[PDB]
Amino acid sequence: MKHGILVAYKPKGPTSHDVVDEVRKKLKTRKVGHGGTLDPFACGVLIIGVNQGTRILEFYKDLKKVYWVKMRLGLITETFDITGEVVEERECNVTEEEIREAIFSFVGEYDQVPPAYSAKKYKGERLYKLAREGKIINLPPKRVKIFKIWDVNIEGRDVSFRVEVSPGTYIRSLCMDIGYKLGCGATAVELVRESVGPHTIEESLNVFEAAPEEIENRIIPLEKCLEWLPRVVVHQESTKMILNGSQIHLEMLKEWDGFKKGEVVRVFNEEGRLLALAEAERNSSFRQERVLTLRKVFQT
RNA sequence: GGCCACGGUUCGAAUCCGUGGC
């Protein structure tokens, strides 16, 4: 029974949950989840948690992502992709200069409204559910930031490019907005998430074509997970304490590794075991004041 | 853990997580 994260590949077609089920089918379990959904029409990196690993999934939602996208100008749908049933073709007569101009005009920060077809919630129901019932929701915008755009390739009306964006950014909205700026409209047709944080699509595995063994081996152990984030070590004695509630104090730490305030921290004992993730209560300077407050404990 | 309500995450998560209650 392994416990950790699995960098999987979601083929174009099935939903993010269809991925989980596939996994939990192979590993014969139920403790399975993902740390970030991918629209069915898209494909790429999908962080999948196994057993105790599901507990750390929430930390991947804050990682930068890298997508390769291909939108089609002059196309518009209600879902912002090619799976929409209400399409509207529009005449596109813009110069490649006007296109690239619009594309890079988005590098930076802007307020992105979430597509009505999102998993966001309004009043106990999911937007995509409400949208299908005929009620479109207009949620408040989210200041999203586009870090950079590269490998732009223009072919007639099919524009394509790579982009790195902050967490919570919708590539569907990005395209729709670029199509607006261009007046002809735009719709995402192909979307490929090349990476989430440091997890590439190369390090990924197509759980749908692999066997249990193959899937098992590719699971990263809680220790090796969340490579980013500060890691502190505690004297082998204090371990039993931590595994039984108990906050962490100065006299329990053996190594520091500077960190912030409410910043998450990894807690290792001496034998080299992840004991728990905890939020700092201070900074990182030189009395038994609780210096770290538990945030999650692992009974692997 | 389980059973309810509410959120989260790039859309068909009841199924994963997180918050409240028991």
Side-chain angles (χ1 to χ4, degrees):
Chain A
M1 175 170 278
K2 325 274 183 180
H3 295 286
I5 305 304
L6 167 66
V7 186
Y9 180 79
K10 189 195 86 60
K12 195 258 288 180
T15 66
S16 283
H17 191 289
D18 289 338
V19 195
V20 166
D21 279 336
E22 177 70 3
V23 168
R24 86 206 308 175
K25 169 193 182 66
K26 302 286 179 77
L27 307 191
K28 298 194 188 301
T29 329
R30 290 296 298 175
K31 261 307 205 84
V32 183
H34 65 262
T37 325
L38 238 198
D39 299 323
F41 94 106
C43 83
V45 178
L46 180 75
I47 273 50
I48 302 302
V50 181
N51 292 308
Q52 283 292 305
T54 75
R55 309 248 283 134
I56 43 177
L57 297 176
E58 69 153 53
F59 299 93
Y60 292 82
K61 75 187 175 184
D62 306 319
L63 291 184
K64 295 178 182 178
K65 316 256 191 311
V66 161
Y67 306 84
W68 170 79
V69 66
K70 189 202 289 187
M71 41 177 216
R72 168 134 73 245
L73 301 179
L75 181 54
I76 297 183
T77 46
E78 359 70 78
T79 56
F80 291 10
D81 59 23
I82 12 162
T83 63
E85 298 183 314
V86 181
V87 313
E88 162 188 356
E89 231 85 60
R90 175 175 296 164
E91 299 63 35
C92 172
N93 31 53
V94 294
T95 68
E96 289 192 9
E97 302 218 309
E98 292 178 299
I99 297 178
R100 289 184 58 96
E101 178 195 59
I103 308 292
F104 296 81
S105 76
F106 278 93
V107 184
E109 287 183 279
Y110 91 89
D111 314 321
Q112 186 181 73
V113 197
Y117 288 69
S118 64
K120 302 283 195 252
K121 296 186 102 77
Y122 175 54
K123 289 286 292 299
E125 303 160 299
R126 320 214 84 97
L127 288 204
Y128 64 66
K129 177 198 159 188
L130 289 172
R132 303 229 181 66
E133 269 162 38
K135 218 310 185 301
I136 295 292
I137 277 61
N138 212 66
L139 296 176
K142 172 177 169 49
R143 177 69 61 165
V144 142
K145 24 277 191 56
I146 276 67
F147 296 119
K148 59 177 179 184
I149 294 184
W150 71 97
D151 291 350
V152 178
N153 194 72
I154 301 186
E155 291 176 356
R157 52 186 287 159
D158 282 329
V159 189
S160 102
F161 63 83
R162 243 174 271 271
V163 66
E164 186 198 77
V165 74
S166 85
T169 301
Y170 286 99
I171 306 308
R172 268 181 283 134
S173 274
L174 210 214
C175 293
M176 259 294 278
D177 293 344
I178 290 164
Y180 182 90
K181 180 73 258 282
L182 287 189
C184 60
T187 281
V189 163
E190 272 172 50
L191 187 48
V192 181
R193 182 155 56 181
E194 308 212 302
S195 66
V196 180
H199 298 285
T200 73
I201 174 176
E202 306 96 74
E203 303 162 359
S204 114
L205 177 97
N206 184 314
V207 295
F208 283 95
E209 291 247 303
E213 317 82 282
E214 176 165 20
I215 297 181
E216 257 199 299
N217 288 285
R218 314 289 298 92
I219 296 178
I220 310 168
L222 269 128
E223 281 68 43
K224 300 290 185 181
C225 292
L226 298 164
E227 297 115 62
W228 50 103
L229 296 174
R231 87 136 194 172
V232 310
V233 67
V234 297
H235 304 295
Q236 191 56 32
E237 303 188 311
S238 44
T239 63
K240 189 67 181 301
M241 288 188 71
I242 309 175
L243 281 82
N244 282 317
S246 163
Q247 302 317 302
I248 293 182
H249 296 285
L250 170 72
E251 217 175 11
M252 295 173 85
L253 303 170
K254 182 179 169 189
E255 288 162 57
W256 293 54
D257 276 65
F259 43 93
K260 273 292 184 179
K261 210 77 165 190
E263 178 176 359
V264 170
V265 167
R266 299 198 291 149
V267 187
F268 285 90
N269 66 359
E270 300 196 60
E271 68 153 306
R273 163 192 184 181
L274 173 74
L275 253 47
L277 296 168
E279 170 187 347
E281 187 73 65
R282 271 177 170 58
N283 191 313
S284 178
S285 58
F286 299 74
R287 53 166 180 177
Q288 270 300 278
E289 306 117 290
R290 175 194 301 185
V291 306
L292 301 178
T293 305
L294 294 191
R295 168 69 168 294
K296 217 84 68 68
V297 157
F298 305 100
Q299 310 298 55
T300 1

